[PDB]
Amino acid sequence: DTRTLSQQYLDDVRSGAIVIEGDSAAVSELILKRDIPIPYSYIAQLFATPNAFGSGPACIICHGSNNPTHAYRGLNLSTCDGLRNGSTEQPARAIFTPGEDPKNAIIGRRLRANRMPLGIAFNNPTDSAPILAIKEWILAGAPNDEHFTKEILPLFATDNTFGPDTPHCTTCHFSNQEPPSFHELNLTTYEGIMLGADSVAKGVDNATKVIIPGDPEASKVFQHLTEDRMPPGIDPSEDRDHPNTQILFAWIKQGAKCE
Amino acid sequence: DTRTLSQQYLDDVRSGAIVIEGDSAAVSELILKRDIPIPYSYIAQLFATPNAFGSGPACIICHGSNNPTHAYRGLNLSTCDGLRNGSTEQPARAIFTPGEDPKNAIIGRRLRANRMPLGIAFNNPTDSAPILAIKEWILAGAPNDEHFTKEILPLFATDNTFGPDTPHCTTCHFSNQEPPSFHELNLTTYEGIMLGADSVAKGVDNATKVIIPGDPEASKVFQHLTEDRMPPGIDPSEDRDHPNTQILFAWIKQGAKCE
Amino acid sequence: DTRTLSQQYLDDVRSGAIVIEGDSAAVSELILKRDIPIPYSYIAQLFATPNAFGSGPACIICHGSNNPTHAYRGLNLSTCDGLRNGSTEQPARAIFTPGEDPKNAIIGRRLRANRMPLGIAFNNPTDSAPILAIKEWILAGFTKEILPLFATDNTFGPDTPHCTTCHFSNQEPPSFHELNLTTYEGIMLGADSVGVDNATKVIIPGDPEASKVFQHLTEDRMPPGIDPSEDRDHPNTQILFAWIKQGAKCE
Numbered sequence: 099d100t101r102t103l104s105q106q107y108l109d110d111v112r113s114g115a116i117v118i119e120g121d122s123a124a125v126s127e128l129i130l131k132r133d134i135p136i137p138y139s140y141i142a143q144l145f146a147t148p149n150a151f152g153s154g155p156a157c158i159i160c161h162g163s164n165n166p167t168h169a170y171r172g173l174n175l176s177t178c179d180g181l182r183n184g185s186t187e188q189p190a191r192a193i194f195t196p197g198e199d200p201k202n203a204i205i206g207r208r209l210r211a212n213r214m215p216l217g218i219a220f221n222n223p224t225d226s227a228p229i230l231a232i233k234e235w236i237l238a239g240a241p242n243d244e245h246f247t248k249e250i251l252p253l254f255a256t257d258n259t260f261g262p263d264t265p266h267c268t269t270c271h272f273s274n275q276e277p278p279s280f281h282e283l284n285l286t287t288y289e290g291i292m293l294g295a296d297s298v299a300k301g302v303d304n305a306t307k308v309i310i311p312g313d314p315e316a317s318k319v320f321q322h323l324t325e326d327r328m329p330p331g332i333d334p335s336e337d338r339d340h341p342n343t344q345i346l347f348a349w350i351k352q353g354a355k356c357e
Numbered sequence: 358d359t360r361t362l363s364q365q366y367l368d369d370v371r372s373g374a375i376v377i378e379g380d381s382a383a384v385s386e387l388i389l390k391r392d393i394p395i396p397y398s399y400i401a402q403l404f405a406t407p408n409a410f411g412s413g414p415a416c417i418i419c420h421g422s423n424n425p426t427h428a429y430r431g432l433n434l435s436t437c438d439g440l441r442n443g444s445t446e447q448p449a450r451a452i453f454t455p456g457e458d459p460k461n462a463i464i465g466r467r468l469r470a471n472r473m474p475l476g477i478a479f480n481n482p483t484d485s486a487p488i489l490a491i492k493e494w495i496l497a498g499a500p501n502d503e504h505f506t507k508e509i510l511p512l513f514a515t516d517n518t519f520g521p522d523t524p525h526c527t528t529c530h531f532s533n534q535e536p537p538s539f540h541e542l543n544l545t546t547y548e549g550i551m552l553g554a555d556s557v558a559k560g561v562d563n564a565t566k567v568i569i570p571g572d573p574e575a576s577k578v579f580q581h582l583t584e585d586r587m588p589p590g591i592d593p594s595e596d597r598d599h600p601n602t603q604i605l606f607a608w609i610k611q612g613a614k615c616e
Numbered sequence: 617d618t619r620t621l622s623q624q625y626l627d628d629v630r631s632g633a634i635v636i637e638g639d640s641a642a643v644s645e646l647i648l649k650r651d652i653p654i655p656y657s658y659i660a661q662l663f664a665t666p667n668a669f670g671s672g673p674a675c676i677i678c679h680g681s682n683n684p685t686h687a688y689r690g691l692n693l694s695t696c697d698g699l700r701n702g703s704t705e706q707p708a709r710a711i712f713t714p715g716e717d718p719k720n721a722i723i724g725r726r727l728r729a730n731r732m733p734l735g736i737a738f739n740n741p742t743d744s745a746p747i748l749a750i751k752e753w754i755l756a757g758f759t760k761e762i763l764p765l766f767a768t769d770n771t772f773g774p775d776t777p778h779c780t781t782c783h784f785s786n787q788e789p790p791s792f793h794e795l796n797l798t799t800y801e802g803i804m805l806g807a808d809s810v811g812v813d814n815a816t817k818v819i820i821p822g823d824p825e826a827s828k829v830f831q832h833l834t835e836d837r838m839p840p841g842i843d844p845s846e847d848r849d850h851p852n853t854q855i856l857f858a859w860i861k862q863g864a865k866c867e
């Protein structure tokens with residue numbers, strides 16, 4: 099106990115414990131690192147203010163109610179209870195779990211995860227023929243059979259597969275070396291797809307699995323194929339590590355408290 | 358219909374009914390088109406936040422009371438009731454009518470209509486001699502008589518008429534061909550003035566009469582001469598179709614409900 | 617005199633009393649000039665909103681409480697009484713005085729005074745060897761121990777220009793705010809000597825805290841890491857000062 103915020107700051111400026119890289123810095127090093135408590139009052143404002151996590155209309159316009167005709171998915175982001183409840187319209191689901199890191203919970207993917215193939219517009223269907231094919235393949239336990247090789251593998255290497263005028267996934271995900279291949283993810287072979295991302299620069303048994311056999315809902319490929327970044331139409335190049343995103347995550351790790 | 362937002366959406370991307378042009382898109386096709394209900398809470402934030410409709414101070418600073426010594430025109434934009442009442446200081450007048458399209462109501466012109474001649478500074482009087490002349494000419498039924506040709510017609514073709522270092526209207530409004538004449542409006546002759554704008558590339562059925570004989574208050578000419586765009590000093594080139602404006606308009610058409 | 621806001625305006629467009637220079641103008645000529653009353657409701661929104669005075673996180677995040685372990689300096693900017701009270705943590709002190717101009721008060725300096733040397737990062741210490749050397753000299757009311765620090769590169773932190781880089785002459789361009797930091801007299805005369813006997817005094821002997829030099833050396837502009845070139849006369853700053861001068865009223 100006992101040592102003040104001011105006291106640690108004076109000590110950390112002294113030790114060089116504060117590192118400054120593309121500030122931002124004020125937030126990572128003085129707010130998150132020292133685990134300062136975030137009031138719901140600030141979070142409420144975030145969901146209610148246009149451009150709060152990146153370019154686009156305020157979240158509560160489209161998600162301002164638990165009535166599915168007044169709000170998409172009957173998701174009410176405008177109150178603390180509404181946030182904690184998540185989507186109401188069938189199929190109902192929480193968009194995060196209080197006290198747990200939401201980085202990969204639904205609210206996190208919707209704020210940070212660009213839909214794939216990178217740049218594809220939201221008015222392309224998320225239940226098209228190929229997506230549904232990939233879905234069934236994952237359900238099937240993600241087999242390396244004849245069917246996969248002829249009917250599934252080329253989806254990652256063929257132009258205009260998931261919408262008009264879009265590049266094959268293989269354009270950007272084709273090796274295990276970062277530069278030039280993003281997240282060290284290789285989608286050219288079965289072996290590469292099941293291996294997943296970040297397999298070199300951070301373990302190989304600690305790879306970020308991108309297909310989870312039997313569970314399409316949790317498979318990062320399927321998610322990126324079917325989930326549009328919010329607010330709809332946001333440009334993929336907008337900061338995925340926006341301070342407001344981070345502060346929101348912090349408030350959730352702290353218990354998503356209502357005061 | 359009794360169909361939910363989500364359902365309308367999954368149906369609209371499939372059919373291709375969603376058109377994307379320079380977002381904007383999220384707002385026009387998902388918010389306005391689907392007739393989503395706008396809460397007063399958001400509107401309040403619009404009038405209380407600086408730069409909400411384009412660059413400048415928050416509206417409620419200058420319009421925060423029905424007491425004419427605390428607020429210009431005794432106009433209170435800070436409460437729902439204040440909005441509905443409008444300007445209180447004599448001459449008292451509503452600034453919109455609940456349930457009616459406000460695009461050309463007082464609130465609409467003050468957000469979207471740049472004062473003419475374009476760019477003229479707001480510290481130029483709005484009751485100068487030329488304006489009053491034009492006012493009276495419209496009161497008289499806008500005759501094409503001897504008087505008009507001599508005393509009124511040149512007011513649109515003479516530099517520095519409505520203020521210092523301002524170009525003649527005739528600089529930008531001189532034919533019915535857009536490029537080069539703005540809004541296809543011609544102020545060089547009586548015939549052109551009564552004809553009005555937008556009569557050509559979209560026909561005589563999208564014509565916009567710009568002088569309404571017997572009513573200066575309703576004549577778009579008189580309006581542009583006397584009404585400074587808000588907040589004062591806002592650059593003419595600021596988006597005249599700001600999303601928050603479009604949302605403000607929507608809330609008014611829905612009835613300006615206070616919850 | 618008993619004319620409404622609207623009436624004063626019409627008289628002022630007519631009189632030419634309204635002057636427009638790089639707007640900005642609406643707030644200086646219509647809000648501040650006519651002393652429109654500023655509501656606390658707006659002021660609260662200012663401390664609660666990110667980027668309200670320039671780039672950076674909202675003030676009430678780091679200063680949201682009178683508990684020095686939940687808010688820096690035990691300063692609560694999130695309530696009206698919190699504001700008036702100021703810093704709770706020792707040394708406890710108010711950050712402004714209601715009814716008095718706050719421009720060079722603590723809240724004003726933190727909004728408007730870029731830390732020196734210009735551009736210096738906030739993770740550089742403010743009780744380092746050179747600065748502490750200087751603190752005692754002002755307390756004392758020389759040439760070898762104090763003076764050279766203003767013409768020396770990398771004095772107060774790594775990769776920083778010597779103060780003399782920007783303050784080396786008598787008039788404005790190329791010397792900012794007409795201040796010359798190379799000699800004893802230029803330092804005691806102060807800035808804006810072109811002045812010359814009402815020049816903005818920059819050192820107050822016996823009082824480090826009111827000496828503008830000590831202030832700029834030890835006080836980081838808020839929010840921390842804000843780029844020095846961000847408008848130092850932000851309209852929201854000006855409105856806040858207006859609210860303080862009006863009595864810092866809570867209703």
Ligand code: HEC
Binds near residue numbers: 159161191330
């Ligand atoms: C309309 C203009 C929207 C705005 C503004 C925001 N979102 Fe949204 N959201 C919108 C649609 C059409 C959908 C898909 C609906 C469907 O039935 O498929 C979504 C989806 C979400 C979700 C996921 C819902 C779920 O998994 O059950 C989330 C978590 C979400 N949106 C959040 C969100 C946030 C945080 C926003 C502001 C930054 C935001 N949305 C804006 C439409 C619109």
Ligand code: HEC
Binds near residue numbers: 296323
């Ligand atoms: C470049 C033009 C790309 C194409 C084509 C595809 N993706 Fe992509 N991917 C790209 C980037 C820049 C990123 C990083 C995140 C960001 O939005 O900037 C990603 C990431 C993924 C991931 C997540 C990886 C993780 O470690 O969590 C997945 C699962 C993914 N990409 C899959 C994927 C698929 C299936 C694609 C084709 C349909 C595809 N990507 C195309 C860039 C590009």
Ligand code: HEC
Binds near residue numbers: 414419432467587
């Ligand atoms: C002062 C700094 C102002 C700010 C900020 C805004 N407005 Fe304003 N407004 C101001 C003046 C000096 C005037 C004209 C006064 C006169 O006596 O003629 C106006 C006028 C309006 C009106 C017209 C109402 C009428 O009855 O004629 C409207 C509807 C209006 N202003 C709205 C408005 C909005 C929406 C603002 C924010 C975007 C806004 N004003 C800012 C002074 C100031």
Ligand code: HEC
Binds near residue numbers: 474540542
């Ligand atoms: C160019 C430098 C212009 C001068 C000089 C004047 N106006 Fe104009 N006007 C201009 C533009 C670009 C527009 C479109 C709206 C915008 O703000 O960008 C207009 C519009 C009008 C209108 C309304 C037209 C409509 O379709 O409703 C009117 C009635 C009008 N302008 C009249 C007008 C008068 C009387 C002028 C001289 C005092 C004048 N304009 C100058 C560009 C320019």
Ligand code: HEC
Binds near residue numbers: 105128
């Ligand atoms: C953390 C991320 C902060 C944000 C956001 C803001 N400020 Fe701050 N402030 C912060 C620190 C680390 C310090 C120094 C602490 C120390 O012990 O020296 C300060 C200091 C101030 C002060 C001075 C208080 C005093 O007693 O002298 C003031 C008046 C101040 N800060 C105000 C302020 C404002 C107005 C902010 C938003 C615009 C703001 N701070 C943001 C940390 C952080």
Ligand code: HEC
Binds near residue numbers: 730
């Ligand atoms: C530029 C490269 C600078 C260096 C190096 C130093 N200062 Fe400076 N100073 C600079 C500017 C552009 C300004 C104007 C205000 C602003 O923040 O932009 C200032 C201001 C001061 C003042 C106050 C002047 C006044 O009229 O009140 C002081 C007292 C001051 N600066 C002192 C100072 C010291 C002690 C420096 C080195 C240790 C120093 N300055 C370096 C630009 C630059």
Ligand SMILES: [Cu+2]
Binds near residue numbers: 099
């Ligand atoms: Cu302890």
Ligand SMILES: [Cu+2]
Binds near residue numbers: 358359
């Ligand atoms: Cu029906």
